[PDB]
């Protein structure tokens, strides 16, 4: 039970998390054939009775939790209907829920923050653009078999109500096991990476005062290689969780030119671009796609640009905001990232500097400072206390902080040298 936790190298809530993740394809066995099947009412059944069995087997307390929400949001689909108040009660409510859960390792937060943002969506859907025309919904199980999902519950992507009763019906397309292998093999090399990089270099390494003094280039250095290798405990649960979404059908975004089915419907990855990428505006523009276009597409596409920027950032620091580390990871892509692109415009497009530096001779250098970029970033998340964060901060002589704001200074007058 708990030996197999101990034996790999993960932690105890990893395996009952991983298992979890995994028992999805057994239980995608059943939408393999059954779903061909003409009763729609057996579908939404099932998912509900697999994602209350998943909820309850990694934790019996969250059951009550995401079932409290589903049925208070549905009464809200009776109650108030798409009056404008419905979206503003929605909102505040289920982040007011969600919040509670924080000043209240894996905790049951886990699927709880998936899908306060799923029904949320639910309520701007349930609520135009050539998208908004097309995402919009139209007029008691279908709410309960939306938030429970077992592809999609845990960590999984935010899925249009729309589309989700595609999936009942037609999936809005050939059905495939090829893809999800793909997705599957690439997911699991990712678990290996993970497992075996994990115990060498960990976190209570940045806190520890052995060496974390001695070093200064490694002090950096090591603050490179971690948050790199960090991140590969997302980007598993990212690749296996959509490998279940499209075993299913789910994962399919449509066809192409070619006749050829698209399988970037709920990509929550693009691993050739996340990695091997001199410039980081794609890697940060969105590792977590969908998590990234939910945020584009239901806060910053309904909210003046300019003071949007600051608001729909600031709700993904109202999103978990375990203490001032959360809120400090979500002030970099508010800041090196639009640097980055003004260095991006430097080049090729300028009357003074851009001349010079426009040809193929003005690689290694720019991926080098790309990945400390995110390491010195991703600082602040995994550990995000105080006490914890500053610790680090101030060993490392607080370079980012000053790096980006001494570019922010002289880059204007670059433009003019």
């Known amino acids: 039970l708990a030996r197999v936790a101990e034996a790999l190298g993960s932690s105890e809530q990893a395996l009952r998390l991983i298992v979890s993740i995994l028992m999805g394809y057994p239980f995608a066995l059943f939408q393999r054939y059954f779903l ?102 139209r007029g008691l199980l279908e709410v309960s078999g939306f938030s429970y999902f077992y592809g999609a519950f845990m960590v999984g992507p935010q899925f249009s109500m729309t589309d989700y009763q595609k999936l009942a019906k037609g999936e809005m397309r050939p059905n495939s096991f090829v893809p999800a292998l793909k997705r599957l093999s690439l997911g699991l090399l990712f678990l290996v990476t993970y497992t075996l990089s994990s115990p060498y270099i960990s976190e209570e390494y940045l806190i520890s005062d052995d060496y974390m003094e001695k070093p200064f280039w490694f002090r950096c250095g090591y603050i490179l290689v971690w948050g790199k290798i960090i991140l590969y405990k997302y980007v598993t649960c990212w690749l296996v969780t959509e490998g279940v979404c499209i075993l299913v059908g789910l994962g399919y975004n449509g066809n192409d030119q070619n006749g050829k089915p698209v399988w970037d419907a709920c990509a929550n990855m693009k691993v ?51 203490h001032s580390g959360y809120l400090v990871c979500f002030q970099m892509e508010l ?63 607080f370079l980012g902080h000053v790096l980006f704001f001494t570019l922010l200074l002289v880059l204007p007058y670059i433009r003019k040298l």
């Open 36 to 137: 061909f099947q003409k009763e729609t009412y057996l579908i939404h059944l099932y998912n509900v009775f697999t994602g209350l069995s998943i909820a309850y087997f990694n934790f019996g307390m969250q059951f009550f939790h995401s079932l409290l929400c589903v049925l208070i949001q549905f009464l809200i689909l009776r109650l108030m209907g798409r009056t404008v108040t419905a979206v503003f009660t929605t909102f505040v409510f289920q982040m007011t829920y969600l919040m509670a859960g924080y000043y209240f390792d894996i905790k049951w937060t886990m699927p709880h923050c998936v899908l306060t943002l799923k029904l949320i969506g639910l309520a701007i859907d349930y609520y135009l653009t050539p998208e908004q025309r097309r995402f919009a919904v």
């Open 272 to 322: 050739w671009l996340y990695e091997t990428t001199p410039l980081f505006t794609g890697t940060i523009a969105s590792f977590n796609i969908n998590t990234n276009a939910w945020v584009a597409r239901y806060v910053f596409k309904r909210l003046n640009k300019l003071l949007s920027q600051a608001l729909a950032l600031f709700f993904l620091a109202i999103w978990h905001g375990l």
């Open 335 to 397: 800041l090196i990232v639009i640097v980055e692109r003004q260095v991006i415009n430097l080049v090729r497009d300028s009357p003074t500097l851009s001349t010079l530096a426009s040809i193929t001779a003005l690689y290694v250098l720019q991926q080098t400072n790309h990945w400390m970029f995110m390491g010195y970033s991703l600082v602040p998340f995994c550990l995000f206390t105080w006490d914890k964060w500053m610790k680090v901060y101030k060993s490392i002589y």
